[PDB]
Amino acid sequence: PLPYPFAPRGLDLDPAYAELRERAPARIRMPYGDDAWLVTRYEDVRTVLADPRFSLAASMGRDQPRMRPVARTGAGLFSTEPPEHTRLRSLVARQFSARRVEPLRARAGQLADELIDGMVVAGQPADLVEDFAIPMPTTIICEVLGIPAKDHRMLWHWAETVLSAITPQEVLATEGRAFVEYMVGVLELRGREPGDDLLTALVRACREEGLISEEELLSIACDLLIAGFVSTTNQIGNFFHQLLVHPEELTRLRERPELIPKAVEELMRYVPLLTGFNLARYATADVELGGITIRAGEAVMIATAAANRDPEVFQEPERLVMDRGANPHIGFGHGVHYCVGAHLARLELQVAIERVLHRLPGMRLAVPESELSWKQDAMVNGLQALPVAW
Ligand code: HEM
Ligand SMILES: CC[C@H]1[C@@H]2C=C[C@@H]3[C@H]4C/C=C\C(=O)NCCC[C@@H]5NC(=O)/C(=C(O)/C=C/[C@@H]4C[C@@H]3[C@H]2C[C@H]1C)C5=O
């Protein structure tokens, strides 16, 4: 069994994935838990994500392949399949739908401008990670959920604990307990003090309409907050890094910003974001895949970043092509667990790029590229700091 995940080298795709796609699904050994099959070929990853025989509900209570000593538990979206998953996801679908996040575009741009203001007042160099990439999406998801602004820093502390693959399990357990107690309290707060936020609407669904249990309500609230805190914070930094090291792309995006959506989709395809955050499904029946047979009860993991460079699906897959047309990337997943945050994340990435490139037409690295440091032993690829001048 191949040790997994591979040690990250920046945002580079590990060269071993090229050979992996051309063979049968490989046996992998994670740091803890069951061994598993690893699927990398685009068609094979799509099959795992669409075939109901590969189940996240079946993973609960198993010795899951994972990065941490203790296995995940829960009642929410990452733990269920239809029809239970559907009842939960329908309650969040309105707020995360493209139609309902689009009105946030102006607020997101105002926030970006405010953050860029503070970078200007503070003087060069700025750090795009601490000064922009972290605050912008964390603020937004807090506003959508109805999380009070004063708790930003406390919640980012928790996010840093979750983001480290190396967090000692006692600390992870005590901060975990306190985070859940905090969210229990917020759910009480939104029932006494309703608002036009998602957690208020989810509290109604639980405690007035009996549509979800208290366990399901708390699971969804915690899942949505954590995912919102750890995903786009790192991805914004990664996209600015790739744009800065491909400067020949910046003048088109600055002058003709209607080109930014397609570039965001290409960068979504290209960038390996999630590493330690990888869901393991368990097969509920025997399944033939890639010339091998995945037995009932065995575990399967996917590598979306590898599938996203499969030469049968993408022309010139190893090149960053910012106007790429045929781009059916799996950067947000597929099937019933397709990223519920995709429209919000997309909007944030688009706005970040539009605002920063307009406000800072001379933006460039403030250190040599060799002096950049990537986060180590993280669950998500990202930079520790991104020093820029302008
Ligand atoms: C660029 C940022 C993001 C990327 C690359 C990303 C990626 C993904 C991927 C690949 C999956 C599918 C995983 C699988 O099926 O194994 C997924 C699911 C999910 N993501 Fe996103 N995500 C991002 C941002 C977000 C945001 C902002 C939120 C919440 C506000 C979010 C919440 C979720 C949830 C709750 C699911 C599970 C949905 C379900 O099971 O029904 N993600 N994400
Ligand atoms: C952006 C999309 C991401 C998404 C973002 C955040 C979530 C991840 C972080 C949540 C909790 C956390 O780490 N610690 C608290 C208890 C530790 C316990 N021990 C584990 O092993 C374990 C997990 O593995 C959890 C994985 C969660 C899957 C979620 C991720 C799925 C991806 C597609 C536990 O919950």
Side-chain angles (χ1 to χ4, degrees):
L2 181 65
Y4 205 71
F6 312 133
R9 284 173 244 99
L11 304 174
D12 293 359
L13 185 68
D14 192 293
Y17 285 115
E19 325 152 8
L20 283 188
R21 284 194 311 266
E22 287 194 356
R23 300 157 18 203
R27 291 291 293 182
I28 52 167
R29 171 154 314 167
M30 297 282 282
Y32 302 93
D34 288 343
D35 286 347
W37 301 99
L38 179 70
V39 169
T40 59
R41 173 169 289 262
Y42 183 94
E43 71 167 316
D44 287 348
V45 170
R46 294 268 296 216
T47 292
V48 163
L49 293 174
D51 190 310
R53 287 180 292 170
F54 299 106
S55 162
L56 289 166
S59 88
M60 304 304 291
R62 310 280 324 258
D63 194 16
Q64 304 176 272
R66 60 191 187 271
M67 312 281 302
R68 286 182 210 284
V70 179
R72 171 171 76 80
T73 61
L77 300 169
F78 307 116
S79 292
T80 56
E81 301 291 357
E84 297 87 358
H85 176 272
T86 318
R87 176 170 49 76
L88 303 192
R89 171 105 177 211
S90 286
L91 291 173
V92 302
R94 42 273 309 280
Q95 286 237 28
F96 286 94
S97 75
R99 272 163 77 77
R100 296 323 305 148
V101 315
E102 186 61 23
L104 302 179
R105 191 168 299 262
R107 162 71 186 135
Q110 190 213 356
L111 177 55
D113 272 331
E114 283 170 18
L115 292 166
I116 297 162
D117 286 352
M119 284 162 63
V120 167
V121 169
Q124 318 188 13
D127 166 25
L128 276 180
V129 174
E130 186 183 357
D131 307 336
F132 189 90
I134 290 170
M136 173 189 182
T138 55
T139 295
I140 290 169
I141 191 54
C142 282
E143 288 178 358
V144 165
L145 295 177
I147 296 283
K150 73 159 185 81
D151 302 323
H152 285 183
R153 280 181 176 176
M154 179 276 286
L155 287 165
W156 183 249
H157 185 97
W158 169 230
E160 287 181 318
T161 302
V162 173
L163 282 170
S164 180
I166 262 53
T167 296
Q169 90 186 261
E170 43 149 29
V171 171
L172 187 73
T174 88
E175 284 200 49
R177 281 192 251 112
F179 170 71
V180 164
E181 273 180 342
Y182 164 76
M183 294 293 318
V184 162
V186 177
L187 297 182
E188 322 209 337
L189 167 59
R190 297 280 146 260
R192 297 190 324 281
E193 311 291 13
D196 267 45
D197 47 86
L198 178 52
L199 294 182
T200 290
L202 290 178
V203 168
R204 263 177 273 132
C206 175
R207 283 178 194 148
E208 300 182 353
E209 310 168 58
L211 297 181
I212 55 177
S213 68
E214 292 279 347
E215 220 211 350
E216 294 172 329
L217 162 77
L218 175 69
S219 219
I220 295 163
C222 293
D223 288 352
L224 286 183
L225 185 284
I226 298 193
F229 262 58
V230 308
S231 58
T232 315
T233 44
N234 286 291
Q235 193 75 311
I236 289 164
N238 296 340
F239 282 20
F240 279 127
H241 176 270
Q242 295 295 285
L243 283 170
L244 290 159
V245 293
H246 296 90
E248 66 276 354
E249 303 293 352
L250 296 164
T251 76
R252 270 188 293 279
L253 299 179
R254 264 168 183 127
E255 304 200 8
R256 290 172 61 210
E258 73 264 41
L259 298 173
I260 289 168
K262 255 196 211 315
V264 161
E265 293 312 297
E266 172 69 342
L267 288 162
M268 278 305 296
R269 176 195 74 85
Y270 195 69
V271 171
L273 174 62
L274 305 175
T275 58
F277 295 142
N278 249 302
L279 299 169
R281 295 155 166 89
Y282 281 71
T284 65
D286 279 22
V287 183
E288 309 284 298
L289 191 72
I292 64 144
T293 165
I294 294 171
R295 298 289 176 182
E298 281 174 355
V300 50
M301 291 170 49
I302 66 174
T304 60
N308 282 344
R309 305 197 194 191
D310 190 326
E312 318 224 298
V313 179
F314 308 91
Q315 190 200 305
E316 303 196 291
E318 302 294 331
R319 192 160 84 99
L320 189 67
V321 182
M322 296 295 198
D323 65 337
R324 187 180 293 279
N327 190 7
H329 70 79
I330 329 176
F332 286 121
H334 189 65
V336 325
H337 302 278
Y338 179 81
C339 172
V340 72
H343 311 296
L344 183 68
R346 198 171 269 135
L347 174 147
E348 291 172 350
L349 295 165
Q350 281 174 17
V351 164
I353 294 168
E354 189 273 324
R355 284 282 85 227
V356 165
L357 292 187
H358 279 104
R359 290 280 307 268
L360 308 183
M363 186 166 78
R364 57 183 180 284
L365 286 172
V367 303
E369 155 180 8
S370 84
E371 277 178 39
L372 293 173
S373 72
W374 296 91
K375 258 157 155 23
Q376 276 330 327
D377 305 287
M379 304 290 273
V380 174
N381 284 327
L383 283 160
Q384 177 77 246
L386 183 41
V388 298
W390 57 90

